[PDB]
Amino acid sequence: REVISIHIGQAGIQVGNACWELYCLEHDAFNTFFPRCIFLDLEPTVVDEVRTGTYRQLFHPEQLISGKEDAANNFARGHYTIGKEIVDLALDRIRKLADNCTGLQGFLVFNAVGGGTGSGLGSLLLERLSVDYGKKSKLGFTVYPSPQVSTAVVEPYNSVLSTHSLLEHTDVAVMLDNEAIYDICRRSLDIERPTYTNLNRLIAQVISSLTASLRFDGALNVDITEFQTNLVPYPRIHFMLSSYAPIISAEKAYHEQLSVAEITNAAFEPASMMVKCDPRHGKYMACCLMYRGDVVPKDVNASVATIKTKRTIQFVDWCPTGFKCGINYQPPTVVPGGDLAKVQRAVCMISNSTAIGEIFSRLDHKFDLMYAKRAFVHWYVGEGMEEGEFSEAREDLAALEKDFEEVGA
Amino acid sequence: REVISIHIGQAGIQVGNACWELYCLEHGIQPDGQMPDAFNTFFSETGAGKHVPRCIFLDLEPTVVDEVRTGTYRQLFHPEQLISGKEDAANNFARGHYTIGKEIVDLALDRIRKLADNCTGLQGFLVFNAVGGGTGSGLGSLLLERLSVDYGKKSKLGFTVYPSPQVSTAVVEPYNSVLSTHSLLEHTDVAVMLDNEAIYDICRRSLDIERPTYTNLNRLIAQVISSLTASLRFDGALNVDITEFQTNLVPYPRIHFMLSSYAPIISAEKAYHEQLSVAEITNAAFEPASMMVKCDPRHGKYMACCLMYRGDVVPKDVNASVATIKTKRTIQFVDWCPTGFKCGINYQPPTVVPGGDLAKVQRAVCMISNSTAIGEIFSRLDHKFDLMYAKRAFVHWYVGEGMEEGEFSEAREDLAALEKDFEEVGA
Amino acid sequence: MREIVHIQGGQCGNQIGAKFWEVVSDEHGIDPTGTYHGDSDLQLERINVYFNEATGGRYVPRAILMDLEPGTMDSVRSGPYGQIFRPDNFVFGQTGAGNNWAKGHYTEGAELIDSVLDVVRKEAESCDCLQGFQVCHSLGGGTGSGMGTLLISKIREEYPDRMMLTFSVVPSPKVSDTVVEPYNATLSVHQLVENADECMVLDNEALYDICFRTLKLTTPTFGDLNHLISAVMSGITCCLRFPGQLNADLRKLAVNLIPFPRLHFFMVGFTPLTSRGSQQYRALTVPELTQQMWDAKNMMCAADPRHGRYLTASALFRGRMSTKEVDEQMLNVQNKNSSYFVEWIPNNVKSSVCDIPPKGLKMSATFIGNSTAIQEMFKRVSEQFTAMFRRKAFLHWYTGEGMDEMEFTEAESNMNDLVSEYQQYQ
Amino acid sequence: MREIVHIQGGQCGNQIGAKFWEVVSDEHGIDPTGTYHGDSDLQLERINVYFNEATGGRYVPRAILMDLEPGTMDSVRSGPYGQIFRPDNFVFGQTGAGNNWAKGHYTEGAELIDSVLDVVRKEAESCDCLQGFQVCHSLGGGTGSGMGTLLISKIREEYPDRMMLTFSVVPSPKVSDTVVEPYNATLSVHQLVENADECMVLDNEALYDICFRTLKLTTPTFGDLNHLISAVMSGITCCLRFPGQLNADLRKLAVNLIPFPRLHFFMVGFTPLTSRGSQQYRALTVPELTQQMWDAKNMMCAADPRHGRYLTASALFRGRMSTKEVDEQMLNVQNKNSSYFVEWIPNNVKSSVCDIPPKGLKMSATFIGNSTAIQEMFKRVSEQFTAMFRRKAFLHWYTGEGMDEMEFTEAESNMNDLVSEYQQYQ
Amino acid sequence: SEMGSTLTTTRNNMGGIFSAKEQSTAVQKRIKLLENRLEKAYVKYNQSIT
């Protein structure tokens, strides 16, 4: 059993540069990863940093795909003009990666929707993967732009135009912001001046905690097909809040008494979500709890009972059994230079609720304001688009808002 | 069973620095937090061999907190427990109760909640504050308000420092004491007074220390608390809990103000030449030369008394000794109460800390009584508070913060009403 | 965290501040280059109150020099510890007012004060939690009095909820350097009573008296006077910079010493201050600090408090001391001389101890007393103001600049009702 | 990989470009003799963006000097970093235009523009993936403005997809060297609005003002002004030459700052800029860089941005810094000064971080604000243009060369409709 | 100010944070006690019958 990982863009392969560092440091159990990867980007600067880095010999030279020139924060450019010449080479490699494989669980894609490469050719890669395989799962861990913290200007245009394909192509989509992670590193990790490297290190922790069930034998294992049923009650509602516990420094960890009861609680407070949204406004549709390390089924069982009996958070009226647990034996590993201390046990929670319906509504106004005056539209239209797909992507998010409001009732 | 201890203000967390020092030196824990089961009431165990105290230091000024962060016990306290503000209330009750208090007490509450959640058989809380300041007075009363609405049934042992009659450091402290008692009245279940001149006289005469600083004061306060929690920590021939004082000592839901004392406070040399037994320490616990509040119970009448005994003490002589006290006529009990005593004996002696000026004594008594001499102190406060209030001195600072003239008059008549209440129960 | 931005105005302000920054930097172990060279870790914990780290141990003072003639600015950069100030903080005019309060408050102030305000804004927003501002100036001169007072008024309407100290020397007939001293002092005090939170009265007459008897100096130049004033300023704000058994911050002192919003003029003294001939024969205990503190011939104003009544008083102690001794000494000096204290306030003295002595001594103290005898200065100044203004002396230099006659009458009324209102609470 | 061909025109272009190739050659560690002598590996792998390996480690720049007078060519060849160009690239006429736009655009350009196009083509297809061209010229002179402008039009006809940067200085009436400045600048802008991709507007008032106030230079010759302009140009194309945590090429910045195709005139600023006497009195943090960036008295144009609103803004950072501080600083200035920004556009600031600082510094920054205050200069120019053209001053020097009256009216029309669209979007 | 006042009165009306769980757990335990008592009473009656 193996699962291969695709990384797109400046954000994608930097996340991968930390994720693969953790995989090699963690390791027959290796068979699911050893790498079965592909980096691809339009700007050669970040890929060729890997080609000369410490992991020169680790990656086969062909694997590291690199175009000639960047899409430059332009969804249309990275989806219609420049994507068309590189995407064919990428997926015609990924095929022979799958032919190397025999028991493919799925693919997992890493991209940020704000940019052009992460968004544009992300969706383009996804569309040819869906028509080629269809049944095989493709987990997409995307990075959406934050409400108030922002680096680009045209990112609302990109985020809406990317989402229109992220609905019906990916199977399980995990949101991740930058402000929420910045807040996590500021609050729990007490790092007052964080950079992208620290963000990517703890993103890898989440990925590792949800594939450790395939790699190592636990008391209750869970495959990628399991998330497919247990968390998405409707074919078009797959957008997951993420959380992790205990995110804790090296000194505080020894002082505190980490156990199963309190980390099940800590994984539920909005002070520890990976996406800037308040689930107090929403109702939980389903929850999924990956437990790693020193876990007996009793205290995880007792912990979900206390959550259900609390009234600070509510569930939908549909699910009395609104949980999916999972226990694995091997504890989480640490990276030298990393900030997370060694813990006997950790919890990665992936939920689904209606709080996500707020982020789309928040997104709508920013896109709406700019589009009404036709700001920046001339860049995308001359690239090959029209006014049709702007308006039609707009009404797709309008439908999604009504959808969440209907299901939440 | 567990009890958590919260410290508010400069005087509060300094007192804690002596208490937790005494605690680890008693249970054999190094300041770093590891042993080289009775510690379960105060320390929670990480499971990696590290013990962390159940306490939260909080105040408004970061100076006194951050020497603690860098003393010997940097590694004993969990970092989140040591709360600290950014600017001081500055001897201004209103500033600590409405301006700056309203931002800091909510952080303390959502901290203290998970201390209680880690506990199982919580006996209660116990708070440390000096009413002369603004932090310990202002947000202290605010914290007690929100604690009463949260728990209610749980004990809140208030070990407060009242301003001394003559020896004082601040000038607006009469205002602070009256307004604070107005809420400390109906929130604290059991409130123990600890003056400063009385402790000064004990260290001068008994400990024969002629140049005492605050260190020795805080040291002997920790000794009384240790003598009071030994019954909870260790097994004795006749033990009491913290819920026992709620019933056995306060006859009416508004008369809860106790006079504390301890014996024997004896230097290193008197002990070598002097004898320790139960009868003489039962005597020495009652004489006003060993009280912790400047008042005289000889002027008052006792409602009920309490007696902690530590060390090699049998129960036959504690009964015989308390009998001799009742047959004497220097002190008298209230007509309504034929029996006025609550006794208790525990096996473990008081341990000593190196560097302290307390000798290693074979036996000790901690007395906690209730009387009517406490009514004289409250009246004594009213004379000099009313003295300045009529001319409206220093009122402009509190009213500029957002208060008015109404709360002075209404708090004034409430404590004035308490004066009449004390006089009518004594009759 | 708690932060003080420092402002020096006029020639008087510049020399006072110059000797002040040498004393503080030497306490924190920073050499003239501006790099850290101390030993104790305690000296580094509390340098955010007065300094900013620039790069590689370079600590710059959080001060602003403001004047009108370049002689003072060049005299500052020449002397030692002159190379530590940021050259951009030398906000500075060119023409000169010259002992004309109207020129200092209406003509040259109107184009320099926007500049000094902009520097102060950067210095205030550069830090996080303001404790207050600290302004040192004189009341006789023009570029210190009129401009500095306008700066005080402008700042108070900008940040109204922060404290503000102003150390001002005031003129007296025995030390009469300029001729229009009363016309400057009376208008300046009118603005100070309505703007400043608290003032600390100083004078040059008492400083000369201190240097004659107590110091027994041969040649008391201005360097020694500025040395005494600097020791006082360091002594009062020592509590924010070092921990102690009983800490008392600036706001804690203000609310404890000011009973009414208009009664904020204090007289200050400092101990120990002894000559080298008798410093060898002395002892260092609490009673010897007190009975040299509360001596009338040690006050730094020419306003003898026993000609009035004490409202409140304060002592800031520095060094490893026993708090019992501190409190009993304040009790003794209040019980014996009970007549000199106000009657409707018991325990008139606020006290505090800090555990870091200044370098060169083992134990020191600092006294701040709010007496009612300060009205001697107000009557003493107002009669000279009246003596010229009844006859319209020197008036046209004030009138021809924009001021009219009702400004002097309003200023007279406010000073006159102030000394009247001190007398009533007396 | 990505390629930048350099084209310099006129006296202003040649001397600006001379200082430019000095600082770039030092950044890549190339000696004045043309051979590599650097230390770090990083300086080798991205020199093809600016150089061509000839033979024996001879790295020659990919530049084209262009003028009409030999004084500039000989002064270029004389000084250091003068013997690194290929002598075939010194395409060079002989007669000279002399501040006559018609000579440089119709008569004398007609025989030179053929030779420059031959050289630039052979120099363009020599590299594989062209990123764009980079032109440095003026709008007051004749052979710089007119010929350079005509070259821009011909290049955009051949290569319509490739990028185009133009660092152009504009004349201002406070620093007015020639008499026919309005006649030239107005016609030059008429061609820039339709031919260039983006134009980074410069001026000498702000440059002289910057060296007076912030740099505090005594004698700011053209060397220092050209040094500042070169530092801006190195900062704008540092992303291609060095790896960073967030990259932003030329096209990436263009699409994030140009909301409408005719709105492509920028203001530029460079930080940090500090006097030599105060270089050690300061920190090096992101907030310090931001305070100097958003100062209106720091743009390198004589147009106060606070006289209008920003449409967009860009900040290219260089150095080891935390991205969170970058975004928090941009968000902070976006909230507090809310009126100076356009409302129907949130996020008016694009940011980027490169990991290699310029030589000698620790952390630098480049600001490119597309504001609506730039319309004041176009009005500031058009009022002068109408003053002459109402009365046909100096007109015959251009009329007898080919321009008719409709050309000047067309230039006024384009100028007037442009200032209305900036006013519209404010 | 009005929202703050409504917050304080609602805060006093909930009767504390831990109040809801105690009342819920008390009635549940009460259910168990009546069930236990009912069994013993049934046993006595059926024993009487035999």
Ligand SMILES: Nc1nc2c(ncn2[C@@H]2O[C@H](COP(=O)(O)OP(=O)(O)OP(=O)(O)O)[C@@H](O)[C@H]2O)c(=O)[nH]1
């Ligand atoms: N968590 C995380 N996010 C990143 C990182 N780098 C970039 N991003 C995000 O990526 C978004 C922009 O896309 P980029 O990945 O930088 O660039 P791109 O997706 O390759 O698109 P192009 O610039 O056209 O090449 C920004 O909003 C960032 O939040 C990173 O290292 N970690």
Ligand SMILES: Nc1nc2c(ncn2[C@@H]2O[C@H](COP(=O)(O)OP(=O)(O)OP(=O)(O)O)[C@@H](O)[C@H]2O)c(=O)[nH]1
């Ligand atoms: N018994 C005892 N009392 C102390 C000690 N330290 C301070 N105090 C008392 O505390 C009173 C003033 O309050 P502090 O605790 O010092 O200050 P605070 O309560 O935090 O109020 P602020 O100064 O506004 O912060 C004084 O009257 C002292 O009597 C101590 O170590 N032991």
Ligand SMILES: Nc1nc2c(ncn2[C@@H]2O[C@H](COP(=O)(O)OP(=O)(O)O)[C@@H](O)[C@H]2O)c(=O)[nH]1
């Ligand atoms: N203590 C002290 N006072 C000074 C010093 N220099 C000037 N003065 C006082 O300043 C007063 C005159 O004010 P002046 O310096 O002209 O003020 P300015 O012109 O406004 O700056 C005199 O009464 C002096 O006593 C000094 O170095 N130390």
Ligand SMILES: Nc1nc2c(ncn2[C@@H]2O[C@H](COP(=O)(O)OP(=O)(O)O)[C@@H](O)[C@H]2O)c(=O)[nH]1
């Ligand atoms: N910054 C800078 N500006 C210059 C330089 N030389 C000329 N200028 C400006 O260019 C304008 C005149 O342009 P000119 O040299 O006649 O252009 P040309 O004749 O077409 O080459 C004047 O306003 C000068 O301010 C220089 O070396 N540096």
Ligand SMILES: [Mg+2]
């Ligand atoms: Mg990218």
